[PDB]
PDB file of C-alpha atoms in Angstrom:
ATOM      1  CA  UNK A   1      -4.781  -7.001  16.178  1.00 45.56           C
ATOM      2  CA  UNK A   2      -2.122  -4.836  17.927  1.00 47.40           C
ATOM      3  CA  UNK A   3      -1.310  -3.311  14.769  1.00 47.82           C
ATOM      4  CA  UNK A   4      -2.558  -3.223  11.028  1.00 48.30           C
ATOM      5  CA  UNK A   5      -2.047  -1.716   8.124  1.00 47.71           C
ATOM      6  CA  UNK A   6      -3.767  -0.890   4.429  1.00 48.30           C
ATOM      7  CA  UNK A   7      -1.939  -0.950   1.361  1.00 48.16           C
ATOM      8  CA  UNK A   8      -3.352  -0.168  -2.403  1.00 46.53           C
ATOM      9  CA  UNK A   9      -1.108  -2.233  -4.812  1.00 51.12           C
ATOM     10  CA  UNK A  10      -1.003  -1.267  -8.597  1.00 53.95           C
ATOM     11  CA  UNK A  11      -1.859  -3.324 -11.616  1.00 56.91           C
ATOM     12  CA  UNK A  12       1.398  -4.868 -11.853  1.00 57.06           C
ATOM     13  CA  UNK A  13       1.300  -6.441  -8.596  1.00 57.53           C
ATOM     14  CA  UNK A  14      -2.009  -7.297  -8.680  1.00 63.49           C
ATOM     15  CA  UNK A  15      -1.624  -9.681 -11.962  1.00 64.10           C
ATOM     16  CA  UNK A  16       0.004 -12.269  -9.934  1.00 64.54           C
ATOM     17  CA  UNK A  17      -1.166 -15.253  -8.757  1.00 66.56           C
ATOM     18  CA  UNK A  18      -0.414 -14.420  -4.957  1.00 68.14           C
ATOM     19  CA  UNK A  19      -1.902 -10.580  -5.046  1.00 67.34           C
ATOM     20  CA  UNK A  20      -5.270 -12.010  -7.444  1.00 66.19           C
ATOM     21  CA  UNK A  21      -7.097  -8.689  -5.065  1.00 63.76           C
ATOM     22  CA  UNK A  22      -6.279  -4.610  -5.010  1.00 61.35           C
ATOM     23  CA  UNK A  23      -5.496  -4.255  -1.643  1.00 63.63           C
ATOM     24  CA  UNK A  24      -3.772  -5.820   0.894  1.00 60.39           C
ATOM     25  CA  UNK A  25      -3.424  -6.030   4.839  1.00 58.94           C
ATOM     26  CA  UNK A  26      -0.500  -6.216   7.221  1.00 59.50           C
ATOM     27  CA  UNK A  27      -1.493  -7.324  10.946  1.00 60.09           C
ATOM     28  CA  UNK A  28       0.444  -8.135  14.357  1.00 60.13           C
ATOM     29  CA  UNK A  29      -1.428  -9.921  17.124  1.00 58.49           C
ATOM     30  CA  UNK A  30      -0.490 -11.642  20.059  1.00 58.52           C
ATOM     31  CA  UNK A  31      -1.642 -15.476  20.596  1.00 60.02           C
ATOM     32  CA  UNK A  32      -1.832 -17.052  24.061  1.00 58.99           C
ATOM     33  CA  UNK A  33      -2.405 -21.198  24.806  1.00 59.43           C
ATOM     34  CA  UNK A  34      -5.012 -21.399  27.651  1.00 58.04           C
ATOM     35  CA  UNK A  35      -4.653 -24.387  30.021  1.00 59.73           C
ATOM     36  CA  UNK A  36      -8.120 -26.661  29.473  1.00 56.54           C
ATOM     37  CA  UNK A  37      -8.411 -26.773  32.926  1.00 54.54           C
ATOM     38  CA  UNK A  38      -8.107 -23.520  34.596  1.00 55.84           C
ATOM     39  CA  UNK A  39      -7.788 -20.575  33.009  1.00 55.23           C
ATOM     40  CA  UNK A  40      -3.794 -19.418  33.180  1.00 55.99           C
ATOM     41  CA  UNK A  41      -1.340 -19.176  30.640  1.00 55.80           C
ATOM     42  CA  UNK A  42       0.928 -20.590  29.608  1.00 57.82           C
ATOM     43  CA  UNK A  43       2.627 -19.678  26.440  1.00 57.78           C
ATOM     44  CA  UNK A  44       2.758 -16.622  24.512  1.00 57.49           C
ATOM     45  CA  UNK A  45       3.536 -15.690  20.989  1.00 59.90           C
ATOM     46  CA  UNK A  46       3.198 -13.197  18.714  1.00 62.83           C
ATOM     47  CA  UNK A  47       1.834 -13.822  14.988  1.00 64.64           C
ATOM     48  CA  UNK A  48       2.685 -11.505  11.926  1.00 64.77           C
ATOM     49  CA  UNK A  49       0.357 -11.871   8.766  1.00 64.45           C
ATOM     50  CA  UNK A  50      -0.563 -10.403   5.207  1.00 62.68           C
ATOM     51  CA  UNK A  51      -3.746 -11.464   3.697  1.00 63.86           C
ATOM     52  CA  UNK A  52      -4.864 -10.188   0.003  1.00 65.91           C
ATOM     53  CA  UNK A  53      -8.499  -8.583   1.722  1.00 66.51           C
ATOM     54  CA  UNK A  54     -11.543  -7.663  -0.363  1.00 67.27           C
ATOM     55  CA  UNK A  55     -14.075  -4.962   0.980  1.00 67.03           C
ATOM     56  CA  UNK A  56     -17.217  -6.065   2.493  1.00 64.86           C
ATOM     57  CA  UNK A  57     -18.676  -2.639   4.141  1.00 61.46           C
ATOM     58  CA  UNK A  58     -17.869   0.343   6.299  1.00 63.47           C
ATOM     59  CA  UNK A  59     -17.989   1.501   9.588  1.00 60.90           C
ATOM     60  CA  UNK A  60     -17.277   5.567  11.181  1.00 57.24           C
ATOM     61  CA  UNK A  61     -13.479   5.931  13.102  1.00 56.28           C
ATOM     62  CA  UNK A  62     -12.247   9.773  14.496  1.00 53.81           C
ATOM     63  CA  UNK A  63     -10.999  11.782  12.399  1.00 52.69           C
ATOM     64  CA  UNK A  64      -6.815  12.058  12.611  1.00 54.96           C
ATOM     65  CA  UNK A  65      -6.328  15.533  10.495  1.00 54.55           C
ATOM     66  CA  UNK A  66      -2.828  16.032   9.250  1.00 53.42           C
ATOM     67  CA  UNK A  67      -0.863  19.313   9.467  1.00 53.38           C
ATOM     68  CA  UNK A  68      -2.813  21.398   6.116  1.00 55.12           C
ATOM     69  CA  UNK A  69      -6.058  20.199   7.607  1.00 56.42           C
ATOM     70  CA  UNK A  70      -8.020  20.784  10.899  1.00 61.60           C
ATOM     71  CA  UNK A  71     -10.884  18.830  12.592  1.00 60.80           C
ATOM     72  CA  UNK A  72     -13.667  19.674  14.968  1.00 62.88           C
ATOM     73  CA  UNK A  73     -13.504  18.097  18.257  1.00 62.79           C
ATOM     74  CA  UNK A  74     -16.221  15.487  17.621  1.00 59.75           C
ATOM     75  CA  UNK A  75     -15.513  14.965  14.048  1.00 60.19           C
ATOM     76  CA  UNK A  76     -15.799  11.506  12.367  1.00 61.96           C
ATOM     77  CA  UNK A  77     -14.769   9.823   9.254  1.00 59.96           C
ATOM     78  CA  UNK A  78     -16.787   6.970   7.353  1.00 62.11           C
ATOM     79  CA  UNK A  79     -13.521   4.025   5.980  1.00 63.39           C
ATOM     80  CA  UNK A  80     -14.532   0.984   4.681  1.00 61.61           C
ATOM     81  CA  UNK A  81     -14.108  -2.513   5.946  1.00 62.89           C
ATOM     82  CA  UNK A  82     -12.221  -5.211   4.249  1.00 65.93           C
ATOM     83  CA  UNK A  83     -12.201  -9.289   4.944  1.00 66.18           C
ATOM     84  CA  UNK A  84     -10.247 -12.529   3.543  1.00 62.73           C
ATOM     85  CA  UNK A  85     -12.252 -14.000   0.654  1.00 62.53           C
ATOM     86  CA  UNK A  86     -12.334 -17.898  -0.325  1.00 60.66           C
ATOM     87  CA  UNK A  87     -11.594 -17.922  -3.439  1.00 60.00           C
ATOM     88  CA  UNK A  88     -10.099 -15.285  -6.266  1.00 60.29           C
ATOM     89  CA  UNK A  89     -10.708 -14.882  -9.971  1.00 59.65           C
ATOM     90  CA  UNK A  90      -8.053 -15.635 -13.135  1.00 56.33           C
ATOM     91  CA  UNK A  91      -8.459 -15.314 -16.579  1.00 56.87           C
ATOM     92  CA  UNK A  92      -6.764 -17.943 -18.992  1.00 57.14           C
ATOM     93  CA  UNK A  93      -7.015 -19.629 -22.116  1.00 56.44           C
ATOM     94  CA  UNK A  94      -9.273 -21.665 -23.814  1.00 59.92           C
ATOM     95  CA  UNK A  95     -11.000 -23.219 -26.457  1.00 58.51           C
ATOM     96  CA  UNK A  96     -14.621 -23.802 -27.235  1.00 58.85           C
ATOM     97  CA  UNK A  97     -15.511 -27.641 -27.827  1.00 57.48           C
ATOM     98  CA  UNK A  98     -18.068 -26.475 -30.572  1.00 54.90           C
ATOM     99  CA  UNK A  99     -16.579 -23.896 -32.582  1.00 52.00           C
ATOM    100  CA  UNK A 100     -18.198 -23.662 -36.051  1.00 53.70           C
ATOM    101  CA  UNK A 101     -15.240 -22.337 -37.455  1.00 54.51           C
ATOM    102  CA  UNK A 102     -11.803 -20.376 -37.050  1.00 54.62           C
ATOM    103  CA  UNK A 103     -13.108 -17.246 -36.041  1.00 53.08           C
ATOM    104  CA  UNK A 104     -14.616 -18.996 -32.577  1.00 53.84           C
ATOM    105  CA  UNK A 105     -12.034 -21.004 -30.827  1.00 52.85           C
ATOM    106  CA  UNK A 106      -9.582 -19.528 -29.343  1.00 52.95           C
ATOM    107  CA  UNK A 107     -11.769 -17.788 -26.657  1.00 55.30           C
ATOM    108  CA  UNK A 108     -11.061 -16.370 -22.392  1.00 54.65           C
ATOM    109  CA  UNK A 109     -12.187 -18.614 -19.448  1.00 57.85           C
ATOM    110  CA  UNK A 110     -12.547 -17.717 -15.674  1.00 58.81           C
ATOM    111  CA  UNK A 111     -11.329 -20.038 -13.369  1.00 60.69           C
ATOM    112  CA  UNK A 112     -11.411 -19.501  -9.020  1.00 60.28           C
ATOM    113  CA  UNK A 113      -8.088 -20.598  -6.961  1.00 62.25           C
ATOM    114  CA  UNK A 114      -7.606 -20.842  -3.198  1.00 61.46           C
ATOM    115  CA  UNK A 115      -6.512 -17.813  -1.464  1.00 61.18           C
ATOM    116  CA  UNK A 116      -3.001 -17.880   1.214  1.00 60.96           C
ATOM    117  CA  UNK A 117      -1.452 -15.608   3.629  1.00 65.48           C
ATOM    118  CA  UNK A 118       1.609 -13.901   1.899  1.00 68.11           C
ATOM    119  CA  UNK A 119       3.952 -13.630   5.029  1.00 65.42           C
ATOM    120  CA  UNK A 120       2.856 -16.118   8.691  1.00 66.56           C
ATOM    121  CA  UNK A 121       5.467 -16.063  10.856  1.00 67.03           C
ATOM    122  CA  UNK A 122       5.814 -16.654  14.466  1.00 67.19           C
ATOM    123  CA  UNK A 123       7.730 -14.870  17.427  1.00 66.77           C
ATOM    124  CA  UNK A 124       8.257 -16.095  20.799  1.00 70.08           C
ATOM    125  CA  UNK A 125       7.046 -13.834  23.568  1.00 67.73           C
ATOM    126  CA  UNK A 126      10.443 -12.190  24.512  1.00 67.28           C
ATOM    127  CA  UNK A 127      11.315 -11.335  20.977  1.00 64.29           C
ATOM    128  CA  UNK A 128       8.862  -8.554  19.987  1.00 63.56           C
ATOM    129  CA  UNK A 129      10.918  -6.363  19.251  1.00 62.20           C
ATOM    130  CA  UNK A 130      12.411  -8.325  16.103  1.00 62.02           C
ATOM    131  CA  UNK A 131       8.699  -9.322  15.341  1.00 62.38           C
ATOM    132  CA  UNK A 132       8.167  -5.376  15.108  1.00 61.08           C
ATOM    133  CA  UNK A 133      11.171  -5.086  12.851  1.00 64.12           C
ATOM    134  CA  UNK A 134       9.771  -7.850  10.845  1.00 62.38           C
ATOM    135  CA  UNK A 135       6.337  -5.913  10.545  1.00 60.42           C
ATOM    136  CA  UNK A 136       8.191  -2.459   9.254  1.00 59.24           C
ATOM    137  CA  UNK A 137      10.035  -4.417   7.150  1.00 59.29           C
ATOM    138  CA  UNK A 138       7.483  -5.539   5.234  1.00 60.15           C
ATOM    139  CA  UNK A 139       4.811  -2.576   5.612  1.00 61.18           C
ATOM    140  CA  UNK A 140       8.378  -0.902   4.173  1.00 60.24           C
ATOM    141  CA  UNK A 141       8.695  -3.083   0.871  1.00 57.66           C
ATOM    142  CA  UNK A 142       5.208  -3.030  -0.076  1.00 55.28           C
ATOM    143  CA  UNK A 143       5.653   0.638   0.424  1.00 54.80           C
ATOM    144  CA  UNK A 144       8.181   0.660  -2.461  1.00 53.76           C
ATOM    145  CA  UNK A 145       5.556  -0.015  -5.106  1.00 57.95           C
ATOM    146  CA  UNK A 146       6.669  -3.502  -5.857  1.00 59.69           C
ATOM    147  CA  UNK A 147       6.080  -7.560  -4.509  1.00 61.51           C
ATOM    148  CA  UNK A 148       7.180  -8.352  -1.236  1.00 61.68           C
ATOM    149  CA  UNK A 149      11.007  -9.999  -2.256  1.00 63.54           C
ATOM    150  CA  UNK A 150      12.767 -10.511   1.617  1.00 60.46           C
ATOM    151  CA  UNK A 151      11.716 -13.223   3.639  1.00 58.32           C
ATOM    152  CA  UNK A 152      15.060 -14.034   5.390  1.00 56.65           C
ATOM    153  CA  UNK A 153      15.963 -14.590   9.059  1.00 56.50           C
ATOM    154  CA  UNK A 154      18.662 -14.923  10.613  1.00 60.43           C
ATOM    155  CA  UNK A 155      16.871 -17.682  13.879  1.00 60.33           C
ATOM    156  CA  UNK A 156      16.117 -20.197  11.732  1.00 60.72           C
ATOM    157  CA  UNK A 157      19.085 -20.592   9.176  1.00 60.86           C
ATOM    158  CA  UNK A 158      22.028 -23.349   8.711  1.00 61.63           C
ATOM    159  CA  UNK A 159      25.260 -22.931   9.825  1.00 60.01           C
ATOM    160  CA  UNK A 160      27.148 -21.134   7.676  1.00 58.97           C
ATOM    161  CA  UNK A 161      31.087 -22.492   7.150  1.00 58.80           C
ATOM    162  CA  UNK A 162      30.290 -26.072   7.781  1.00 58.90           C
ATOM    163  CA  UNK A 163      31.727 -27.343   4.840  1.00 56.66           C
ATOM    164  CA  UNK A 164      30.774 -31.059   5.629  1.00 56.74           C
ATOM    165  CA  UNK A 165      27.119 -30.212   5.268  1.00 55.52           C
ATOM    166  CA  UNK A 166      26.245 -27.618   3.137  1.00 55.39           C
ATOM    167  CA  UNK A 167      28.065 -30.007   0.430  1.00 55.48           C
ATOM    168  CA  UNK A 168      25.133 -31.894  -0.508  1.00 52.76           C
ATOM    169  CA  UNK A 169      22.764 -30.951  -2.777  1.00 52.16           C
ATOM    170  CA  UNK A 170      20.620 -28.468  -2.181  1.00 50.86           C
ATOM    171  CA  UNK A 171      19.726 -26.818  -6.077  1.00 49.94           C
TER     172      UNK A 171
ATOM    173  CA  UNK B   1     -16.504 -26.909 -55.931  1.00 52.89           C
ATOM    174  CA  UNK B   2     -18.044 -29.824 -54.163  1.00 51.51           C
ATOM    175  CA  UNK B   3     -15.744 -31.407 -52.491  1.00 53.84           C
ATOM    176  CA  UNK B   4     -15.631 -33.094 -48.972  1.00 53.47           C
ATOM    177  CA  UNK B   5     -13.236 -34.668 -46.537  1.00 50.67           C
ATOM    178  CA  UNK B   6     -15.274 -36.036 -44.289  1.00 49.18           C
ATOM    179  CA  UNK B   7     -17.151 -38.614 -45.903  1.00 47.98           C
ATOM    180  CA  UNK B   8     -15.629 -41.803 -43.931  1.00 47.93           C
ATOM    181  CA  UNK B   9     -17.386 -43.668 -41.435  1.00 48.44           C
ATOM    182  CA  UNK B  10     -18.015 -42.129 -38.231  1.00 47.64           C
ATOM    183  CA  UNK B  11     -16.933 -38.789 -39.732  1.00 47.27           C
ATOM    184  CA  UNK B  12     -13.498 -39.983 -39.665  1.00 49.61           C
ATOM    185  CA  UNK B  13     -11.091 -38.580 -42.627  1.00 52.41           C
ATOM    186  CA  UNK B  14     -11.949 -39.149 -45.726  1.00 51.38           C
ATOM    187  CA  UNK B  15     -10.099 -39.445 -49.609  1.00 52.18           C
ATOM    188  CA  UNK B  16     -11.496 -36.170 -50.866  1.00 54.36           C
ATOM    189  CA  UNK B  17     -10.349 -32.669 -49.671  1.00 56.57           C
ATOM    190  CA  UNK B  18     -12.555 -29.476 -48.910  1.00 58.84           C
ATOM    191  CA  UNK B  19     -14.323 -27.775 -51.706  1.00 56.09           C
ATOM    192  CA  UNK B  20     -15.467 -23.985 -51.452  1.00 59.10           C
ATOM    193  CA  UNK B  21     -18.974 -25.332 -50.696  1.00 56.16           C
ATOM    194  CA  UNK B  22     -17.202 -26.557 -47.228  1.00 54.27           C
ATOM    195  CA  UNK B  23     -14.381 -24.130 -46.674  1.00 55.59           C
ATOM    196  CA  UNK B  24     -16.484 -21.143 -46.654  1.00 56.73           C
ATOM    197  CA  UNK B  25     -17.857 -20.287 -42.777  1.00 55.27           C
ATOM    198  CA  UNK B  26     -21.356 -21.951 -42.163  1.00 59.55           C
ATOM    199  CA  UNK B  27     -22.075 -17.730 -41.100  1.00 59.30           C
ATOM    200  CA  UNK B  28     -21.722 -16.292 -44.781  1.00 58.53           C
ATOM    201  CA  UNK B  29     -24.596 -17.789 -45.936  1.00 57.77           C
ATOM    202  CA  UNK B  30     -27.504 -15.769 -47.961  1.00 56.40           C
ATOM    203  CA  UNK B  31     -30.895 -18.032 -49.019  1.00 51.53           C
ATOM    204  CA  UNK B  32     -32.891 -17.050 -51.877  1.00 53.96           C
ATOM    205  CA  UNK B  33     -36.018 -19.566 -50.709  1.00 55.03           C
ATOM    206  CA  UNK B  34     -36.356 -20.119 -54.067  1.00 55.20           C
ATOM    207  CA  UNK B  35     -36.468 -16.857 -55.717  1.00 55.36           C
ATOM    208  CA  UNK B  36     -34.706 -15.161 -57.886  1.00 51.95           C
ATOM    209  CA  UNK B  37     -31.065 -12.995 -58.117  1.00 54.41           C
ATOM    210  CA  UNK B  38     -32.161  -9.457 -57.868  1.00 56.41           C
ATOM    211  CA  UNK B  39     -29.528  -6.609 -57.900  1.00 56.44           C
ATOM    212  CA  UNK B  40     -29.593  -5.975 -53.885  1.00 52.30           C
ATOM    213  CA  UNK B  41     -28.432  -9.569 -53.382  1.00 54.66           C
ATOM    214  CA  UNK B  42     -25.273  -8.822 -55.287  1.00 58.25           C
ATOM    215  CA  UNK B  43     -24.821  -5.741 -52.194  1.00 59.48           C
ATOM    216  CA  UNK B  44     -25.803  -8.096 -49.660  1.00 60.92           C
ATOM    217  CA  UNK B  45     -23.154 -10.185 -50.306  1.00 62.11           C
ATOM    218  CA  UNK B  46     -20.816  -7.515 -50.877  1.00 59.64           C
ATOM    219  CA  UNK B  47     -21.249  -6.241 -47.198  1.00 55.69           C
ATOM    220  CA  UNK B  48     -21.550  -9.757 -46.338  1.00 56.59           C
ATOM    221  CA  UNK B  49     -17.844  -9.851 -47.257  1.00 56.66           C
ATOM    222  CA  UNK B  50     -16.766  -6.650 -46.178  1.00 56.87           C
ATOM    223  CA  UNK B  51     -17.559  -6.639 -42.822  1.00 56.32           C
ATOM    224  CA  UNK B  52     -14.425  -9.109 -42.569  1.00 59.75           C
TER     225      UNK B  52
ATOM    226  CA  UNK C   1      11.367 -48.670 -36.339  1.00 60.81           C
ATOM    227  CA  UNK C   2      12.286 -45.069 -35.599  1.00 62.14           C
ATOM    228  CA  UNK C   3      11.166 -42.508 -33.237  1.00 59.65           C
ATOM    229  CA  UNK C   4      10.834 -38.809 -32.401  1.00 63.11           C
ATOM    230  CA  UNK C   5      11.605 -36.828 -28.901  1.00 63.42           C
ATOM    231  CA  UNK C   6      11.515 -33.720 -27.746  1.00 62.70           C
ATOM    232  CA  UNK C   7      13.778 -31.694 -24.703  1.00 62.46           C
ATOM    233  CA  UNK C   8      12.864 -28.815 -22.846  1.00 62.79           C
ATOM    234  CA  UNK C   9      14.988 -25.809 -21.312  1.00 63.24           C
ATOM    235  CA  UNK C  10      14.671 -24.690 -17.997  1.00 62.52           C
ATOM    236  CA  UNK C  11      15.564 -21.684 -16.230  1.00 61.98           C
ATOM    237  CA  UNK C  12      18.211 -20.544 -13.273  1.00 63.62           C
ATOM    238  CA  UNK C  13      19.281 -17.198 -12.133  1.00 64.19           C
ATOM    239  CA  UNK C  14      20.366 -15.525  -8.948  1.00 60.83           C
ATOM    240  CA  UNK C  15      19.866 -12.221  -7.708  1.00 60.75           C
ATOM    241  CA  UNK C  16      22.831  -9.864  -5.503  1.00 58.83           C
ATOM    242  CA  UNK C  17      21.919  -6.353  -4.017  1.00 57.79           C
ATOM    243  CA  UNK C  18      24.410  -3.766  -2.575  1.00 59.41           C
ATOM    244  CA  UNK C  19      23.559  -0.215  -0.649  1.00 63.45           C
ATOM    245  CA  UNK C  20      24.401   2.954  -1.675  1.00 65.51           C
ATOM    246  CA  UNK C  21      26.806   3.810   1.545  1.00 63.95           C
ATOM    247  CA  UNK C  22      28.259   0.698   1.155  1.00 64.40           C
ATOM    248  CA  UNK C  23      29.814   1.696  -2.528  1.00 66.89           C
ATOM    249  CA  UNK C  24      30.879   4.951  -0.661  1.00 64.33           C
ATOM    250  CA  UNK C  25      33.274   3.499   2.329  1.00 60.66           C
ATOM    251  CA  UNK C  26      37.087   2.624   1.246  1.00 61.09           C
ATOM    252  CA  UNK C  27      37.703  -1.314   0.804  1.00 61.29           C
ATOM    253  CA  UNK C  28      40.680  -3.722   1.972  1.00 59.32           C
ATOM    254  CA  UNK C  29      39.753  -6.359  -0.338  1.00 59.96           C
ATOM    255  CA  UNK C  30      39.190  -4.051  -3.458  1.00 60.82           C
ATOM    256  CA  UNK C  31      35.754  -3.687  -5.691  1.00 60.71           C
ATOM    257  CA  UNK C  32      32.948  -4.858  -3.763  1.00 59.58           C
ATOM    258  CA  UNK C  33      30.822  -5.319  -7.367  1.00 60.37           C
ATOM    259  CA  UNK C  34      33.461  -7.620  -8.437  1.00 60.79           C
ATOM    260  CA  UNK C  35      33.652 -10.156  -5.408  1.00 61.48           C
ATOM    261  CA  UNK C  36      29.323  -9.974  -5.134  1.00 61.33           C
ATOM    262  CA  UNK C  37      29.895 -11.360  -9.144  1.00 63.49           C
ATOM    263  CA  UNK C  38      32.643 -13.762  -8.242  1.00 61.64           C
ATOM    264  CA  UNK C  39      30.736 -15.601  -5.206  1.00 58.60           C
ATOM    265  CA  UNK C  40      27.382 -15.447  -7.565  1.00 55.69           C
ATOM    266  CA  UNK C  41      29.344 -17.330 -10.110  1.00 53.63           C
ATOM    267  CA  UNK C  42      30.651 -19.740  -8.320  1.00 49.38           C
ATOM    268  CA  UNK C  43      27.377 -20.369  -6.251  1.00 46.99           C
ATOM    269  CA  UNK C  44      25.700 -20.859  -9.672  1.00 41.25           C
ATOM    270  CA  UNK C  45      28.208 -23.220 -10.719  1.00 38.89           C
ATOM    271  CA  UNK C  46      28.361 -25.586  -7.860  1.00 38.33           C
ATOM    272  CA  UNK C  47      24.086 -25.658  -8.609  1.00 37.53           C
ATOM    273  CA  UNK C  48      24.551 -26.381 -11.945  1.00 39.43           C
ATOM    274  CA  UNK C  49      27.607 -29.230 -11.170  1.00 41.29           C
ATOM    275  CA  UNK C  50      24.992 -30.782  -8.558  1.00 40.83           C
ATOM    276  CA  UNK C  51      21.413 -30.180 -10.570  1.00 39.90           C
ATOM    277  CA  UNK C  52      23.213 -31.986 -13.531  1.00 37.41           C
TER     278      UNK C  52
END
């Protein structure tokens, strides 16, 4: 991972169905095909993700102090470590099959749902630049406190003016 | 007072509707085991109902 | 013989965005508000003409 990046989503992001964890992670790597017989390339792309992660332990990084704060010159910080789970919990409605009366039910069940990416998009090696734009772009909009909404690029879009085929339905 | 509605085969619907013996929640329920009414009873089943 | 049915609505929106500067600049073709509402419409409309 060339770059990554953590982000701690509130409670009204994390009710939906597509952020079901509290935190989630923004990554750019770079993906090459290896020939089976030799090894030499020979494509290159790069790959920009966003997985909803869960924390599984920690690990000690150096310490980056920002301009209040000063560090030694072997000081280390402890940060925790975070990984893409299976399967994520909901709560919906029910009702129990042996209810005595009315009082028992309408009751809460817990069900578990597959987990997918948010954003998987691929560049092409001599178009990192708009793959980097692409990853501030979205490290940007999940910096405004809200879903990510903007998806759009301008590669792999229709024609736009060509009357004759942007006439059929589309809804 | 004694009334039931389901009384058809298989426990199906029945002709009769739900008395007060059926109605009430199988919960509120006090047995005597063959005693007699004493005064607590009477608060027993007053808390009975007021903790609803 | 007769029969009962049912229908259910459904839902369909759009959504338009404009930046600040861009409310700011002089125009040659007017409002910019108004023509965003106009070519919302009338993208709505040909949806609804074709969904129906």
């Amino acid at each position: 991972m060339l770059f990554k990046y953590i982000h701690d989503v509130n409670a009204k992001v994390e009710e939906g169905r597509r952020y079901l964890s509290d935190v989630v992670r923004v990554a750019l790597d770079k993906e090459e095909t290896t020939d089976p017989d030799t090894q030499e390339v020979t494509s290159t792309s790069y790959r920009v993700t966003a997985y909803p992660v869960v924390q599984v332990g920690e690990e000690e990084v150096p310490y980056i102090p920002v301009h209040p704060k000063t560090a030694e010159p072997g000081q280390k910080v402890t940060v925790p470590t975070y990984d893409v789970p299976e399967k994520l919990p909901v709560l919906v409605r029910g009702r129990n099959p042996e209810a005595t009366g009315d009082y028992d039910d309408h009751i809460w069940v817990t069900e578990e749902v597959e987990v997918r990416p948010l954003v998987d998009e691929v560049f092409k090696e001599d178009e990192f630049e708009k793959a980097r734009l692409y990853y501030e772009n979205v490290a940007a909009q999940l910096a405004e406190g809200d879903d990510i909404r903007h998806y759009y690029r301008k590669d792999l879009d229709r024609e736009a003016g060509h009357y004759s085929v942007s006439r059929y339905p589309s809804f | 007072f004694w009334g039931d509605s389901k009384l058809a085969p298989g426990g199906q619907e029945g002709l009769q509707f739900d008395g007060i013996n059926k109605m009430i929640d199988p919960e509120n329920t006090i047995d005597l085991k063959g005693n007699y009414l004493e005064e607590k009873h009477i608060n027993w089943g007053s808390q009975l109902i007021l903790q609803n | 013989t007769y029969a009962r049915k049912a229908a259910f609505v459904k839902f369909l929106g759009t959504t338009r965005e404009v930046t600040h500067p861009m409310t700011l600049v002089n125009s040659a073709f007017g409002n910019v508000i108004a023509r965003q509402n106009k070519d919302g419409i009338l993208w709505m409309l040909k949806q609804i003409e074709q969904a129906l």
